[PDB]
Amino acid sequence: MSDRFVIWAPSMHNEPDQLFALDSWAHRYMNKMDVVKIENCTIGSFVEHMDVATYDRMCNMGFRRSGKFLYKVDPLRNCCRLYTIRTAPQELNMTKELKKCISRFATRITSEDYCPAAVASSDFVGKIVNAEMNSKTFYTRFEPALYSEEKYHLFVKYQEKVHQDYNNSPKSFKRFLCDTPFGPEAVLGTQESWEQLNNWQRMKPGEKLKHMGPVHECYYYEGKLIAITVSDILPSGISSVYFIWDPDYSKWSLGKLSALRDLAIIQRTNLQYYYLGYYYGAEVLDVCHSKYIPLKPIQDMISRGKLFVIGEEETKVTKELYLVDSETGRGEGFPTDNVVKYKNIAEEIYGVGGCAFKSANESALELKELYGIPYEEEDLDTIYHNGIPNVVPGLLPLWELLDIMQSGKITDLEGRLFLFEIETEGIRPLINFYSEPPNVKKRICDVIRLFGFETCMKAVILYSEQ
């Protein structure tokens, strides 16, 4: 039925300071601009089926999904960096640009008969809700992420007049915002769970929200469709896929209004977090730890789209940091009061002199020579010049992968992992990792390095040789 993670073998995809992750690299390559160029490149996997608990985990590993494509950015080599951000309704610093946004929303959707019922000065949920229930002109409908003409036509308009994007077809809209790697129950649900989500303003703290999975939230004003939020509703909260709005309603700040509404929906449905990616008392994911760190101390760096690795700097590390497989993607945080202050140690691992590289290459040599897995030395010289790189922040470091081979842990996949060579009959159990051919071991390594050993134990890997 669902707990199986059914995925195509992962790979580097084409395109699904300011451009350098570390000042190390920028300093030695700008005055020398013309000789290099920098990829735009995702790493990821086409997912045929996954449940939403697993995607919740992948989310908190810093993955996002575009349609059925589960992916992340190489935070070291790519021209731009993606940050996974989570916020809760209560950590939202209610600035006034937000308070103004909410306030004009309220007056536009309400009448003149009534006005804010002694609501608190920054209770954005209370104003948002009670304005909406005392409104005759504005509402929203949560519905299944399914194609329709009205939705596509608004999408096209938003794409053209807000992104100068004339590359639209229904097929392309379908693939991006209606195709999902989830099963039919998570997509279509039941009338009763749709009816409860659409009554989220009437939900109280006892209640547990029943619909989990992808949704389209349609905004209607005076019977006209003016925005669509595409969102994944997960056990821990809401992950934001995309937001479409009509250019005509630009002076509504529908971008900001949607985010607050999403958070008010988080609160009233007794869910926990709102996940932005796509970039306050927010928290940003350190992917080298797979934990969150409070945002404001290191806005110093997302400001400049820069790669950061939180550390204490008691020594200068000599290896990429150790990821605990039970702990990855669980959204743990760092400790609150540390005797040390946290420094960003990314240059000592991943910069020009960085330790990660020869440690990777020494392991690739043992990976190939001792276990017959085709890894080879990369980046000995710089990182700017096939497949997933040996060193990628947030992927399992090779020295650690190598310990799975050498300890025998790798054989734990024997009897749990399945392989689907798509030109053969069909699925076959993994019976002897070491007796598999090299390009199969490599794929298994890649899934391990990317989605983690636990998830790989419930994986079915689709591949075609040659």
Curated annotation (Swiss-Prot):
Family matches, as InterPro entries: Acyl_CoA_acyltransferase, N-end_Aminoacyl_Trfase, N-end_Aminoacyl_Trfase_C, N-end_Aminoacyl_Trfase_N
Functional description taken from the UniProt entry: Involved in the post-translational conjugation of arginine to the N-terminal aspartate or glutamate of a protein. This arginylation is required for degradation of the protein via the ubiquitin pathway. Does not arginylate cysteine residues.
Keyword Transferase attached: yes
Catalytic reaction equation(s): an N-terminal L-alpha-aminoacyl-[protein] + L-arginyl-tRNA(Arg) = an N-terminal L-arginyl-L-aminoacyl-[protein] + tRNA(Arg) + H(+)
Protein name: Arginyl-tRNA--protein transferase 1
Enzyme class: transferase
Cellular localization per UniProt: Cytoplasm
EC numbers: 2.3.2.8
Assigned protein family: Belongs to the R-transferase family.
Lineage: Eukaryota, Fungi, Dikarya, Ascomycota, Saccharomycotina
